[PDB]
Amino acid sequence: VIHVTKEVKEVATLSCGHNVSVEELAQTRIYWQKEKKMVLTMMSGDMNIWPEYKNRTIFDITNNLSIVILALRPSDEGTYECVVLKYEKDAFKREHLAEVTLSVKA
Amino acid sequence: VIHVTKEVKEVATLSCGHNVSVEELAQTRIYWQKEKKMVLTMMSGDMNIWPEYKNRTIFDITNNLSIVILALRPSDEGTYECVVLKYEKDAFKREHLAEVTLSVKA
Amino acid sequence: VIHVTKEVKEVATLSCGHNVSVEELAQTRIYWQKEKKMVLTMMSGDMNIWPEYKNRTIFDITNNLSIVILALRPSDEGTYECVVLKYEKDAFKREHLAEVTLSVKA
Amino acid sequence: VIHVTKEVKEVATLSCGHNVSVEELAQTRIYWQKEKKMVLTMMSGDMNIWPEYKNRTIFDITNNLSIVILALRPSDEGTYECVVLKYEKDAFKREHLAEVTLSVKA
Amino acid sequence: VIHVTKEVKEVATLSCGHNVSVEELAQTRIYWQKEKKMVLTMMSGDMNIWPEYKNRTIFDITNNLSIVILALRPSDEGTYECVVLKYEKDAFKREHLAEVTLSVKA
Amino acid sequence: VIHVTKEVKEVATLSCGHNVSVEELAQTRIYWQKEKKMVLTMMSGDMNIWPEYKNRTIFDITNNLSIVILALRPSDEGTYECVVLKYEKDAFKREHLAEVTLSVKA
Amino acid sequence: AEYKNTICPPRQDYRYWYFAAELTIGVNYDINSTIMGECHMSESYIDRNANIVLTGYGLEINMTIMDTDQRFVAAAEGVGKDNKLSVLLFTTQRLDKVHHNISVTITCMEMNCGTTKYDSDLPESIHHKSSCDITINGSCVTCVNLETDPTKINPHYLHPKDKYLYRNSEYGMRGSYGVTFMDELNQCFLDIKEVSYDICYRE
Amino acid sequence: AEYKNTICPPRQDYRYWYFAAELTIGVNYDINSTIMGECHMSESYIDRNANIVLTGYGLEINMTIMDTDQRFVAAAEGVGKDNKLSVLLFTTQRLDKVHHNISVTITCMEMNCGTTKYDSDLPESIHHKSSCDITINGSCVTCVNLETDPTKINPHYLHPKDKYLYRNSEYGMRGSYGVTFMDELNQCFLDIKEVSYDICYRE
Amino acid sequence: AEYKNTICPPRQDYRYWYFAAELTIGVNYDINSTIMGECHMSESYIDRNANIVLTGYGLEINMTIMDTDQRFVAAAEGVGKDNKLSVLLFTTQRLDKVHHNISVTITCMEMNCGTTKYDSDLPESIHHKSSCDITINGSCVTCVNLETDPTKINPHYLHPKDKYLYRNSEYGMRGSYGVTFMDELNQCFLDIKEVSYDICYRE
Amino acid sequence: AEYKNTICPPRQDYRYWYFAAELTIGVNYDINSTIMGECHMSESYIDRNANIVLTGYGLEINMTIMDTDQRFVAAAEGVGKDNKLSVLLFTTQRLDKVHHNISVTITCMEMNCGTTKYDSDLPESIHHKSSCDITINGSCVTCVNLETDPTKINPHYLHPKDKYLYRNSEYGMRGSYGVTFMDELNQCFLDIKEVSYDICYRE
Amino acid sequence: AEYKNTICPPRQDYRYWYFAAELTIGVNYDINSTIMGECHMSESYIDRNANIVLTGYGLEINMTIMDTDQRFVAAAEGVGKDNKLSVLLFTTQRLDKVHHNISVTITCMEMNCGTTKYDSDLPESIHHKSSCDITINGSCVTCVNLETDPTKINPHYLHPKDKYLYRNSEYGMRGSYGVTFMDELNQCFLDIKEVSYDICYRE
Amino acid sequence: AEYKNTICPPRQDYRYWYFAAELTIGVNYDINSTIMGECHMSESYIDRNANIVLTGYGLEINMTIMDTDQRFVAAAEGVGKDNKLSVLLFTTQRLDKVHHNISVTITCMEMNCGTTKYDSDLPESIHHKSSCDITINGSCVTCVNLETDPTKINPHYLHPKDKYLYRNSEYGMRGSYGVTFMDELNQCFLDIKEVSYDICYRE
């Protein structure tokens, strides 16, 4: 679902569209970003959320690496991309790239 | 008849010089125009006359695709060309082109 | 005789130097001119004299296509050329060109 | 020991790091210098110390061609190089180059 | 004798240096000149003397084509050249060229 | 002796360094000169001395073609060159060249 | 030994041109403006057949007049609005007053190339005494219109200074052929005075 | 005798360019700025395989598209910050909407040369309908990212004046591949507007 | 061993010119004005026959003087009003005072070409002691006039600076030939002073 | 199939330079100032031996590094006071940290020529882990000094604009050799900043 | 083994000229002024015979000095009034004081050509110790005059700047030959200072 | 295996010149001033013999130094008053301090040529340890003077900017030879500072 539009103040569920088994998360790096601005990182099980999203961003690993944003704000409109890297022998290989756009009605 | 001259207010009978069977008119397109300005179209049985000629233009299909203009006016002087196109398989092919000039004495 | 000089008011006889039988005059054209200005033409038996010489020019055909000018005038001094053309098949071919000069003593 | 730091007024022992037998000193030349400024020469047994160091420079030949400087001064900071040349047949060949740096705390 | 000097008013005998038999003088032309200015000519027996020398020049043919000038004048100083031309078949050929200089003492 | 120094007013004996027998002097030319200025010549037995040296110059032929100068003067300092030439068949050949310098102490 | 007029011999340069035909081709890919040196041409008068081959603007045009006393001498190309290409053809003079059959082959060379997409015969609209064998190779041509011996068209435009131009003045020698491959009317017309023409370079 | 579209014939100069892909490579040796005449290019359309070989800035890039109706027509190179090399590739028009497998071989030629250091197969991240066989010879490449049929990228930049440019507008035809050899995230991105590009020279 | 005059040896460039003839030709197609370099000439003196071949302005002129001691050295061409071409011919000096027979072949090459349209013999009008064999190949010539040893005509016009010009002064050496193919009088005359001439180039 | 670094392929022009050594030679004949184009260089990498031959200022210098992964890429020459010639040598990058044996042959070519005057082996003064085989042919050399992997020396001077320069920064890789043939101390040193250098020309 | 003077070897350029003779020829056709580059010259010293061949102003002059130690080195030509051509001849230095026989052949090449019109032997007028074999082919020459070892004539005129000139100063070495073919006196004279000369070109 | 000095190898350009000798030749024909490019030279070092051949100003000079370690490298020529030619010779350096035998052959090539007029041996005036074999072919030389290892003469004059000049400073190495063929004294001297010298061109 490339395009998702939610009314203000509601819960925005942005889906990465890919599922990574909990066993393999040791060799996987997951990044959610918004127009070259980092939103969330999950480097080898070490999670990291930037200040602008630290309070209102729940990362659901099991539900297709989705992100739940509570209290959607008019400044959250934009394009989000989810990138997953699998640690092949000696290298990091991108195994999935997704793009989801969020629109705000106000 | 390249040249036809009719006294004002009379009936101007401009002949196309070509006869098309009513059966084949389904596959035929007929256009009467006057110096790059359209006068009449008969696209696949759908007739169309422009505003400057809508009131005073009768299209006689049987009589050699002729046009009868009632109440000839001094602004009608010019060159008229009649073109007939037959819908060959996948293409429209021009099968006739006639030129008739109308002169007004006033 | 290239050079001929006659006392004023006398009769001047300019000879073409060529003789053409009356029988052949049908297929012949004779011109007398004076420095690119026509004086006399005899096209196929049709004679013609220009206004400046119409009154005082007699064209003797038999006497070697001669011209007799009565009442010679001081303005008549110049060079006269007589040209004869025979109508060969499909073309006119020059068969004699002569040049005679007239001088006036006054 | 590239770097040696001694408190002011103490004894500075700068070691050349090379041992030359007294027997071979006849055919040897030893130079101690400091940034292209000569400090000590021992040409074929003839010693020489420049005025800036004449009073306070003892040359210990046996102890690795070392130099002992008494009453170290803040102007003595710099890099010292010790070069030894052996008189091969017809030429002087460099057989050892060392670099020792002295630092002063004040 | 290239150079001849005679006291003024005396007799100046300038010799051509060549002898031409009277028999051959019919075919001979003899010229005496002085610096591109003609002095005497004997063309085929017809003699000729220029005005500046007509009164005081005697042409002795027998005595080596000599010229006798009586009453020598100070303006007569100059170089004289004698030339003899023999009339070869269809051409004139210079058979002798002589040069004699006259000086005047005054 | 390239360099000879004599106290003023004494006798300066400048030697040529070459000996020529009196028998051969007939075929010999001897020149003494001083910096491109001639001093003495002995051409075929005819002697010649220039004015600056005529009174105070004696040419000793037997004593190595030497020159004796009496009353040496401070203006005589310079370089004197002696050259001897032998008259080979058709040419004069330089058989000796000597240079002697005279210094004056004053 | 009876005099008859004959075609003139070949030459490197032709100074006497006869306006033989006007060819208009509309395409579905973008051509912006006339370019100097874009069009090249080759000519061949073999048998009594006169052939011209033009290359330019991503199109190759091979036109042939059959059993003719004419010879192609020059060609010019210009670009009009809506991606229309106008080709002016100049031959030697017209000795005989007879309509000749035409053969035109248009091939795409830069955009929308393909195998033979159209191949048919076009009647001469005005008089119906000759025909034009038309063959389109590709899917790039939308309309084609050919006017042989055009009277109305004025071929002087920027008439070359060193040349002489002659044009037909008789309605009986006009010939018109045309095919449109789009549901709309032919609309292959483009005013001559609104185009910028450049002469093709013989090679 | 049924019409089918076919690839265009080869040409000396191509005027119609399709933005085939964008390739980004990061190196561990200094490259300062774009240089005119630095990049040289060679192209070959053999079988249904299109091969482009680029030499420049101390790298050789050999890219091959397998079983395609496209032919490479041009390439451009530019240097960004952090020693990043951006390569733009232009082919003929896309005929079919099918993802083609890619093969990319990067070889170091001026710094940090060596034997094959990497050889693997990269999935197509967005759709997973193709793959890229990647081979790196040397120890100079730190990251590689390839974007086939880019939509977001704007290939006009200093668009050549004499050419026509076309780009993909569909998200379904996009393709992304990438590998990073450094512990940090890929960070092989470099904005197109911040780079200065120069056209590679055919030879 | 008896002396006799002889023709001069061939030269690359000639300086002494004798005005040998003036040829005037009228055509039925358009010639506008003189063009520098439009005329080329070839010369050949074989046996005692002197031949000049001139190419220019859509015409080829092949002229021959039979059993002569002369040799063509130069030619000039100019265009007058009413589509008249004037040709001036310069030979070596005239050794003997005898009228020579002439042969003129005019052939069309650019307009109204054809097979032999005319072939006849033209008397010498003034004296009738020679003739000119005239042959016209085409349908372009309307009138032809030839003046051999012209007296009245002035061949200095723009006389070349490096040359010397000589002309006849005797009415007894004049010769005139002419044929007109149009019902109107010959009127092939054109004043020399009203024409602009250019020298033909040997090749 | 285990990855290993390898030397780079030969090139016509090198951009990345490593300051490999600094050779200083003193002569007993007059050299006044640096002359543009006075130095020529030849390079050869055969086996694992790298050889540079320099001709200039009346000297020939044949230098060889044994069993190395480097390759000479450039050389520059300059003249200092007291008739001193300074030579800067630039190779490819240093793959391994091991001291290599050197071979230097200095030959006179314009003044004081002769047969082999000196031939010996010089220790590496700082570390004594290698040697330099020195051969002097002539009687012109007074002192010789070689500095391999110089740290203090600054090879930027008038650094060429189109290149990148790299230099060693470790005292453990420094190497020093020297011989003086004059009773005075070596004094073959000459400040780099007081010299004017010109690049030698490959040929 | 007794020394004897000998002629000098041939050279490309001669700097020392001796005024050998002055040749004056009058023609019956117009020559206007001196022209640069008009005269060409050839020289040959075979046996003890010296030959000069000059081509210019419509004449060919072939002069030969028999049994001499001199070689022709230069020639100059100029045009005076009344159609007079003056030719100055320069040889190497004179070794022996003996009069040499001369052979002069004049041939007309542009006007009034013909077979041998004159062939005779002209005595040496002043001293009658030699002769000149004169031949004239044509009917163009009116007078001929040759002066050998001229004293009065001044050969400096515009003396070439890079050369040295020498002339005879003795009356005993002078020689004069001449023939006039016109009833008037010889009058072949033309003052040297009233003529403009140009040097003939060796080829 | 004992070191010995050897002559330097050949070169296209010699930058180190040694003032070997000064040759002065007086002639009886006119030489006005120095001319650039007038003198040409050839050199050959065969066996231990060094030969120079100079051509200029109407003279050929062939000089040979026998059994020497020197090679001629340059020569200059200048003209002084009274028709004196001065030749400066420059060799390589002087390895041995021994007087060598000389052989000089002067040949006249432009004035007063002849067979061998003089052939003799000239002692060395100053020291009498060598000799000069002199041969004059012609009757143009009046005096000859040769100064080998000249001390007084200053060879810098207009010393060439790119060369180094060395000269002898010892009286013991001086050598003087001379012959005069005129009754007056030798007077072959001409001050060096009053002459204008130009360098001969090797060929």
Q: Does K38 touch chain I (CB under 8 A)?
A: no
Q: In the 8-state DSSP scheme, what is residue J5? A: B
Side chain identity, residue F64: N
From I106's Cα to the closest Cα of chain G, the distance in A is 15
State whether H176 and A94 contact (CB < 8 Å).
Answer: yes
Q: How far apart are CA L5 and CA I59, in angstroms?
A: 87
One-letter amino acid at G127 equals H
What is the distance between the alpha carbons of residues F17 and C90, in angstroms, rounded to a whole number? Answer: 123
Residues from chain G contacting residue B94 (CB–CB below 8 Å)? 122, 125, 176-179, 186
DSSP B23: G
- Locate G19 and state its tokens: 């306006």
Quick one: resolution in A? 2.7
The Cα–Cα gap between J81 and I143 comes to 96
Report DSSP letters for G3-53, one per residue: --B-PPPP-SS--EEEEEEEEEEEESS---S--TT--EEEEEEETTEEEEE
CA atoms of J140 and J163, how far apart (whole Å): 35
CA atoms of L157 and A55, how far apart (whole Å): 94
Q: Are D74 and D26 in contact (CB under 8 A)?
A: no
Burial class (CB in 10 A: 0-12, 13-18, 19+), I164: middle
**What ranges do the domains of chain K cover?**
16-98+141-202
DSSP A12-65: EEE--S----GGGGGGEEEEEEETTEEEEEEETTEEEE-GGGSSS-EEESTTTT
Which chains, if any, share at least 3 CB pairs under 8 A with chain I? Answer: C, G, K
Contact between F94 and L122 using a beta-carbon 8 Å cutoff: yes
Q: Which amino acid is at I5?
A: N
Spatial separation of the C-alpha atoms in residues K23 and K87, rounded to whole Å: 5
Tell me whether K112 touches chain I (CB under 8 Å).
yes
Q: For J64, what's the count of Cα atoms within 13 Å in the CB-facing half-sphere?
A: 14
CB B92 within 8 A of CB B44: no
The whole-angstrom distance between J84's CA and the closest CA on chain D is 17
* Whole-angstrom distance, CA of residue J156 vs CA of residue J166: 9
Strand I16-27, strand I164-166: pairing: parallel
Which chains have 3 or more CB–CB distances shorter than 8 Å to chain E? K
The answer, for I110 touching chain G at a CB cutoff of 8 Å, is: yes
How many Cβ contacts (< 8 angstroms) between chains B and G? 41
SS3 percent helix, strand, coil of chain G, rounded to 5, is 5, 50, 50
Cα distance between residue G111 and residue G137, in whole Å: 11
Side-chain-side CA neighbours of residue B1 (13 Å): 11
C-beta of residue H148 within 8 angstroms of C-beta of residue H122: no
Residue with tokens 């010119």: I17
Q: Tokens 């800036």 — which residue?
A: D52
Do D and E make contact, counting contact as 3+ CB pairs within 8 angstroms?
A: no
Q: Helices (DSSP H) in chain L: which residue ranges?
A: none
Question: Which of L139, L8, L159, L151 has its CA nearest to residue L73?
Answer: L8
Distance of alpha carbon L193 from alpha carbon D77, whole angstroms: 61
Say how far residue L198 (Cα) sits from the centre of its chain. Answer: 14
Task: Report which of C66, C71, C70 is spatially closest to residue C100, judged by C-alpha positions.
Answer: C66
CA distance K77 to K86: 6
Contacts of H122 in chain A (CB under 8 A): 93-94
Q: In what order do the strands lie in the sheet with G201-202?
A: G116-123, G131-137, G102-108, G59-65, G49-56, G40-46, G201-202
Strand residues in I81-129 grouped as ranges (E): 84-91, 102-108, 116-123
Query: Going by C-beta distance under 8 Å and a sequence separation of 6 or more, which residues neighbour residue L196?
Result: L33, L34, L78, L79
- The reply to whether G66 touches chain H by the CB within 8 Å rule is no
Q: Do J164 and H30 touch (CB under 8 A)?
A: yes
Instruction: List residues in chain C touching I: CB distance below 8 A.
Output: 2, 29, 31, 36, 83, 85, 88, 90-99
In three-state secondary structure terms, K91 is strand
Cβ–Cβ below 8 Å for L110 and K5? no
Rounded Cα distance, K61 and K22, in Å: 13
> How many residues are recorded in chain E?
106
The phi and psi torsions of A36 (rounded to 5 degrees) equal: 65, 15
The CA distance from C64 to F47, in Å, is 120
Full 3-state SS string of chain D:
CCEEEEECCCCEEECCCCCCCCCHHHHEEEEEEECCEEEEEEECCEEEECHHHCCCCEEECCCCCEEEECCCCHHHCEEEEEEEEEEECCEEEEEEEEEEEEEEEC
Residues of K in contact with I10 (CB under 8 A): none
| B19 CB neighbour count, 10 Å cutoff | 12
Query: Residues near G62 by Cβ (< 8 Å), separated by ≥ 6?
Result: G51, G52, G53, G103, G104, G105, G107
Closest CA to F40 of F27, F52, F24: F52
Query: In this complex, do J3 and H109 lie within 8 Å of one another by their Cβ atoms?
Result: no
Cα–Cα distance, D83 to D65 (Å, whole number): 10
Name the DSSP class of C23.
G
Would you give the end-to-end CA distance of chain K in angstroms?
A: 39
b/e code G34-53 from CB counts within 10 Å (16+ = b)? bbeebbebebebeeeebbbb
By C-alpha distance, the chain J residue nearest L164 is J30
Q: Is K184 exposed, middle or buried (0-12, 13-18, 19+ CB in 10 A)?
A: exposed
Tokens standing for residue G16:
């006497």
* L9/J109 CB distance under 8 A: yes
Neighbours of A11 (CB within 10 A): 12
- Judging contact as 3 or more Cβ pairs under 8 Å, the answer for L and E is no
Are L126 and F91 within 8 A, CB to CB?
no
The structure tokens 């500095």 sit at J147
Cα L18 to Cα A66, L14, L48, L190: the distances in Å are 93, 11, 18, 21
Q: Do I181 and C98 touch (CB under 8 A)?
A: no
- The reply to whether H6 touches chain G by the CB within 8 Å rule is yes
Find the length of chain I.
203
> Could you give the CA distance from residue F79 to residue F97 in angstroms, rounded to a whole number?
13
Radius of gyration of chain I (CA): 16
Tell me phi and psi for residue J30, to 5 degrees: -80, 125
Å between A97 CA and nearest CA of chain H: 5
* Spatial CB neighbours of K69, under 8 Å, sequence gap ≥ 6: K5, K6, K7, K48, K95, K96
Instruction: Tell me which residue of L121, L66, L92 sits closest to L6, measured CA to CA.
Output: L92
Instruction: Select the residue of K6, K15, K93 nearest L114 (Cβ to Cβ).
Output: K6
Q: Is B78 left (phi over 0), alpha (psi -120 to 50) or beta?
A: left
Q: Rounded distance, CA A88 to CA A86, Å?
A: 6
Phi then psi dihedrals of residue J176, to 5 deg: -140, 130
Residues 6+ apart with CB under 8 A from E75: none
Chains D and A touch (3+ CB pairs under 8 A): no
DSSP class of K47 = T
Which residue has 């016509």 as its token pair? Answer: J12
Q: How far apart are alpha carbons I26 and I112 in whole angstroms?
A: 13
Task: Please state, as a whole number, how many other Cβ atoms lie within 10 Å of the Cβ of residue H53.
Answer: 17
**Chain A residues whose C-beta sits inside 8 Å of any chain H C-beta:** 2, 29, 31, 36, 41, 83, 85, 88, 90-99
CA–CA separation, J27 and J107 (whole Å)? 11
Which residues have C-beta within 8 Å of that of residue A94, sequence separation ≥ 6?
A: A83, A84, A85, H122, H123, H125, H176, H177, H178, H179, H186
Experimental method: cryo-EM
Domain I16-202 has CATH 2.40.160.10: no
DSSP for J32-93, written as a single string: -S--TT--EEEEEEETTEEEEEEEETTEEEEEEE-S-S--EEEEEEEEETTTEEEEEEEES-
* Cβ count near D51 (within 10 Å): 6
Can you spell out the DSSP letters for K121-162?
EEE-TTT-S-EEEEEEESS-EEEEEEEES-SSS-TTSS--TT
Length of chain A: 106
Question: I198, I77 in Cβ contact below 8 A?
Answer: yes
- Which chains border D (3 or more CB–CB pairs < 8 Å)? J
Four-CA torsion L94, L97, L101, L103, nearest 10 degrees: 20
Spatial neighbors of F6 by CB under 8 A, at least 6 apart, are F12, F72, F102, F103, F104, F105
Domain count, chain F: 1
Report the half-sphere exposure of I113 (CA within 13 A, side-chain side): 17
Could you identify the residue written with the tokens 């200089």?
E101
E strands present in C19-77: 28-34, 37-43, 46-49, 58-60, 66-69
Distance, in Å, from the CA atom of A84 to the CA atom of A68, rounded to the nearest integer, reads 18
Q: How far apart are CA J104 and CA J118, in angstroms?
A: 11
- Count CB pairs under 8 A between chains C and I: 43
For residue H186, which residues of chain A lie inside 8 Å, CB to CB?
83, 85, 92, 94
Question: Across chain B, which distance is largest between two alpha carbons, in Å?
Answer: 49
Could G5 and I29 be called an inter-chain contact, meaning their C-beta atoms sit closer than 8 Å? no
CB proximity list for B85: less than 8 A, separation 6 or greater: B28, B29, B30, B31, B92, B93, B94, B95, G180, G186
Residue of I nearest to K57 (CA): I15
Distances (CA, A) of K101 to I77, J203, K89, K122, K168: 54, 67, 16, 10, 18
Cβ neighbors of G180 (< 8 A, separation 6 or more) are B85, B91, B92, G142, G143, G144, G186, G187, G188
Task: State how far the Cα of A31 lies from the Cα of J21, in Å rounded to an integer.
Answer: 49
CA dihedral in degrees (J164, J165, J170, J172; nearest 10)? 120
CATH of the domain at F56: 2.60.40.10
Letter for the amino acid at D37? K
Beta strands in B3-44 (DSSP E): 3-7, 12-14, 28-34, 37-43
- Using CA atoms, how far residue A67 sits from A15, A70, A72, in Å, is 6, 10, 12
Instruction: Point out the residue among E2, E36, E92 whose CB comes nearest to the CB of K180.
Output: E92
For residue A42, the enclosing domain spans: 1-105
Contacts of K86 (CB under 8 A, 6+ apart): K22, K23, K24, K77, K78, K79, K80, K190, K192, K195, K197
